[PDB]
Design a protein around this ligand. Structure first.
Ligand SMILES: CC(=O)N[C@@H]1[C@@H](O)[C@H](O)[C@@H](CO)O[C@H]1O
Length: 306
């Protein structure tokens, strides 16, 4: 009867779980992206409306019976973005508790099931977020696909295209990415990449998918692809170092986990990142996420209920 909503506005999808107050997940719903930095406000509003309404339709209950809603989404970086997202949910007619956080905060909650720890995201975007034993939080990275997202899938896809073009026009080292990217995208020639990137409405998720090609080429022995993966791991490590030092956790026991289909999928990248952490922070323990981010959002919403 009573339920909560938890929404993960990740870089790959929007993922909503509806749960009872004793954490029995009743249903989940998937829609497209919800980042106001890469879609119009009307586009995002529509996504969240369609997402919530499809779940309520399966649930058979109205929104005003919902005890709390938590949404962690990419693009919720500033207090001003928090209130914009809150407004698109209130516009549905909800007057209960709404908690809007960055997608890294719900990944922390789902991954560690506590408030204290470190989370690195590398999916279509990248970010590090942490909270120390004193309850103080900090973040690094997360500045988006133009002025940030170092070590994200989007960043690896752009760098893969750049390395393939430099291989083609003779400014860089030869790499099998030169032909492999064209095969993957079903393009005849490198000039076709101009239509693909600038003319066709390409999405961040589409560019980030080229991380699959880099991983494949690394397995085939390609040195350029291997160095792209290594440098992304270093960028991700730098974001942890930044948060660890800001929160004065350099020499404290810390639990760290990771989210996103780039850091969690590519063995070499994950290994290099773990190596950097192990070199620098003896007391950081690395674990896998206990639940997913949408269940983290359920934890944050339900924890606000009596
Ligand atoms: C769009 C922006 O400025 N920053 C987002 C950030 O909110 C998010 O935490 C991160 C990982 O999903 O992706 C970045 O692109």
């Amino acid at each position: 009867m009573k339920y909560v909503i938890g929404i993960d506005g990740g870089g790959s999808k929007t993922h909503m779980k509806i749960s009872t107050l004793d954490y029995k997940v009743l249903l989940e719903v998937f829609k497209g992206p919800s980042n106001i930095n890469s879609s119009t406000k009307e586009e995002v509003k529509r996504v969240l409306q369609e997402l919530i309404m499809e779940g309520l339709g399966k649930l058979g209950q109205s929104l005003e019976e919902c005890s709390a809603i938590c949404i962690g989404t990419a693009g919720a970086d500033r207090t001003e973005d928090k209130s914009i997202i809150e407004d698109m949910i209130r516009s549905l007619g909800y007057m209960g508790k709404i908690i809007v956080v960055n997608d890294a905060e719900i990944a922390l909650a789902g991954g560690i099931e506590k408030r204290e720890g470190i989370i690195v995201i590398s999916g279509t975007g990248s970010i590090c977020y942490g909270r120390n034993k004193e309850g103080r939080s900090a973040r690094s990275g997360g500045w988006g696909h133009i002025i940030g997202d170092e070590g994200s899938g989007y960043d690896i896809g752009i760098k893969a295209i750049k390395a393939a073009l430099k291989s083609f026009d003779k400014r860089g080292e030869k790499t099998i990415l030169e032909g492999d990217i064209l095969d993957f995208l079903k393009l005849k020639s490198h000039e076709d990449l101009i239509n693909y990137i600038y003319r066709s409405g390409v999405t961040k998720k589409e560019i980030a998918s080229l991380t699959r090609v880099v991983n494949s080429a690394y397995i085939k022995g390609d040195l350029v692809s291997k160095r792209i993966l290594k440098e992304a791991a270093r960028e991700l490590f730098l974001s942890v170092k930044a948060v660890v030092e800001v929160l004065s956790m350099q020499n404290k026991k810390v639990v760290l986990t990771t989210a996103g289909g780039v850091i969690n999928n590519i063995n070499y990248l994950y290994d290099e990142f773990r190596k950097f952490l192990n070199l620098n922070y003896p007391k950081v323990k690395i674990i896998s996420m206990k639940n997913d981010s949408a269940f983290g959002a359920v934890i944050i919403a339900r924890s606000e209920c009596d």
